[PDB]
Paper text:
Four helix bundles are also attractive for synthetic chemists because its interfaces are dominated by side chain and side chain interactions, which can be more tunable than β-strands. By tuning two contiguous dimeric proteins to interact in a fully or partially side-by-side fashion through protein interface redesign, we can render the self-assembly transformation of such dimeric building blocks from the protein nanocage to filament, nanorod and nanoribbon in response to multiple external stimuli.
The crystal structure analyses revealed that FLAL-L molecules are perfectly aligned with each other in a partially side-by-side manner to form filaments, the top view of which is in good agreement with the filament observed under TEM. As expected, intermolecular associations between two adjacent FLAL-L molecules are mediated entirely through hydrophobic interactions, as the contact region of adjacent FLAL-L molecules is rich in hydrophobic amino acid residues. The engineered Leu114 and Leu137 side chains cooperated with the original V119, L107, V126, and V130 side chains provide the bulk of the hydrophobic core, whereas the engineered Leu112, Ala113, and Phe147 are not involved in such interactions. The crystal structure provides direct evidence to confirm the partially side-by-side manner of FLAL-L molecules. The above formed filaments coalesce in parallel along the y axes through hydrogen bonds, leading to the generation of a protein layer, corresponding to the ribbons observed by TEM. The significant difference in self-assembly behavior between these two dimeric protein molecules reflects the importance of amino acid residue Arg137 in FLAL, suggesting that Arg137 could act as a switch to control the conversion of nanorods to nanoribbons.
Numbering used by the authors:
A (entry chain H), B (entry chain H): 2 to 164
The structure:
């Protein structure tokens, strides 16, 4: 049941990356709140909470497999963006990086014939598709506002509904 | 309604200190989980969640008062302690530092005649008393185990009950 160290290290690295992800989304919330979009800010706070659930999934899996977690320093995230689109494009680029990190754990797990970790990671592959899809949809809806503040505010209301 | 910058900065500093507090308690959880005390680890995870509620209280108060939040880098917390007592003594020392930081905001708020911030901080003064009390009680119960593993495990079970 004991997990290989190279896979352990990769999962611990990912845990720390999910923590930074949470912090980055909270920083995007600080931007939207300062720009007066409480709905966009709400969506970001929810996303920050979701990223913490990802981190704790990795946390508890590592201990299930006999490893231990070492928390690393969290870098200072950006706190400003040149507009709503710029913020969500930054979120999409961030998620693309997370997705490629997940595939690297998948590669290391299979090289170790660690099918338990391969199975564990399947949820995260599906979740990355979902999260990229949601960010693409927001970018699409924003593009289709064609700069009209009436539409942009209705989008703020919509994203403010996130459960 | 707009808050003074020196008080704004003090609240933003405290927000960042509550974030580190959350991270420190999660790190204590990683220690207890590696030592096989899932009840102690549970208590630490709950405390980490509580510290995030403190941080978000500061977050939303700053925006209520017309300020903005800037998130700073989170330092790497310690991840090892020389035993259960050592961990909780570290938590007590950490909370003592948080408490003196809260009083410094109180001083700056009153110098600005910012009674709104004085009122806001009253909950945190009471919460620090509560948190110091809980850590002192755990240290007392641990001391009274007199090294007996039977009692120490029942304490793990008790702390594992935290809602
Ligand atoms: Fe994630
Ligand atoms: Fe994500
Ligand atoms: Fe606190
Ligand atoms: Fe505290």
């Amino acid at each position: 049941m004991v997990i290989s160290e190279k896979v352990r290290k990769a999962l611990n690295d990912q845990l720390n990356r999910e923590i930074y992800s949470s912090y980055l989304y909270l920083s995007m919330a600080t931007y939207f709140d300062a720009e007066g979009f409480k709905g966009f800010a709400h969506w970001m706070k929810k996303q920050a909470q979701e990223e913490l659930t990802h981190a704790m999934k990795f946390y508890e899996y590592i201990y299930e497999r006999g490893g231990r977690v070492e928390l690393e320093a969290i870098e200072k995230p950006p706190s400003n963006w040149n507009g709503i689109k710029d913020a969500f494009e930054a979120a999409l680029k961030h998620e693309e990086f997370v997705t490629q990190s997940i595939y690297n754990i998948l590669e290391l797990a299979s090289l170790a014939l660690d099918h338990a970790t391969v199975s564990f990671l399947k949820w995260f592959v599906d979740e990355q598709v979902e999260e990229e899809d949601q960010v693409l949809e927001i970018l699409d809806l924003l593009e289709k506002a064609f700069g009209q503040m009436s539409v942009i505010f209705q989008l703020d209301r919509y994203l403010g509904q996130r459960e």
